[PDB]
Amino acid sequence: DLADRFAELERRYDARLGVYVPATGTTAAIEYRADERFAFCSTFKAPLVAAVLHQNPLTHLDKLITYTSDDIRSISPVAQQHVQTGMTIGQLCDAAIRYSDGTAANLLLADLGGPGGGTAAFTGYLRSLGDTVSRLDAEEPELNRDPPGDERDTTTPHAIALVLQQLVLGNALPPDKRALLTDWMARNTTGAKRIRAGFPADWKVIDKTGTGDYGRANDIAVVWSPTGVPYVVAVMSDRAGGGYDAEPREALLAEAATCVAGVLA
Ligand SMILES: *C(=O)/C=C/NCC(=O)CCO
């Protein structure tokens, strides 16, 4: 039984687990703590890129953005390497999604602009997609650090699944912008041990991970069966019982995803 299996994993990892898979033609919604709030952590970077894509002509991707030492304040595997030359918006989108680049994300927030260094406009983008639940209040590094229970910088597996569904499978973005987003998630480098690990190799998996303090580990994905039937999978977790320095546990998500893949196969 699926809920039994998820509860078993929670006990195994001393964790809180949230899971949502939207209903399709022949499958019921899968939901476990799906309406509980979990920190976004880096999962926000996927809808962030969508916000920036949406807001601008496609060739805004070619705009060069410069930044300096005091802009590197978080894990930034790509931006740290290009600080001396700058990065285009396209390069920032790429790094934000594929390397979960924190500086790239901050610069993209600033590009989106408005109050809160773009956090207000980011939240507004989500509201435009009918998400009245999620909220972004801080950028990197602060957004991963809110205490367990605090609503700042949170989404829910349910809310984020419906947002991702519109972005990737629905018509939130024009086809060209949709393809850019989809392809970046498809080429993600951070996700091998999460949802990807739970689905057989003949299923296509695209994703954006999140990791944070208090043992936070998330992953949002779109997967396609070997016959091209897509499902959206959101998995979020925290281990508040270990305190701020609790280790995120990817294996939770891999196991949760295996359970899910078992039902969808
Ligand atoms: C996106 O999730 C970036 C997360 N940066 C923080 C960490 O990965 C370690 C703990 O927060």
Q: What residue owns the CA closest to ligand 1's atom 10?
A: 212
**Do 230 and 203 meet the contact criterion of CB atoms below 8 Å apart?**
no
**Do 200 and 227 meet the contact criterion of CB atoms below 8 Å apart?**
no
Residue with tokens 């991970």: 209
Residue type, 187: R
Which residue in the list 10, 31, 139, 140 is annotated as catalytic? 140
Experimental approach taken: X-ray
| 3-state DSSP assignment of residue 262 | helix
Calpha distance 49→170 (Å, rounded):
16
Residue type, 238: D
Mutation choice for ligand 1 from 38, 42, 78, 220, CB with most ligand atoms inside 8 A: 42
Residues ≥6 apart with Cβ < 8 Å to 24:
229, 231
Calpha distance 238→85 (Å, rounded):
37
Which residue ranges form the domains of the chain, and what is each CATH number? 1-265 (3.40.710.10)
Residues ≥6 apart with Cβ < 8 Å to 90:
61, 62
How far away, in angstroms, is 125 Cα from ligand 1 center?
Answer: 23
Q: What residue owns the CA closest to ligand 1's atom 8?
A: 211
**Do 48 and 129 meet the contact criterion of CB atoms below 8 Å apart?**
no
The region that residue 86 occupies, defined by phi over 0 for left and psi between -120 and 50 for alpha, beta otherwise, is left
The two tokens of residue 223 are: 């997967």
Calpha distance 8→14 (Å, rounded):
10
Mutation choice for ligand 1 from 75, 142, 160, 189, CB with most ligand atoms inside 8 A: 75
Resolution (A): 1.7
Is there a catalytic annotation at residue 42?
yes
**Do 254 and 31 meet the contact criterion of CB atoms below 8 Å apart?**
no
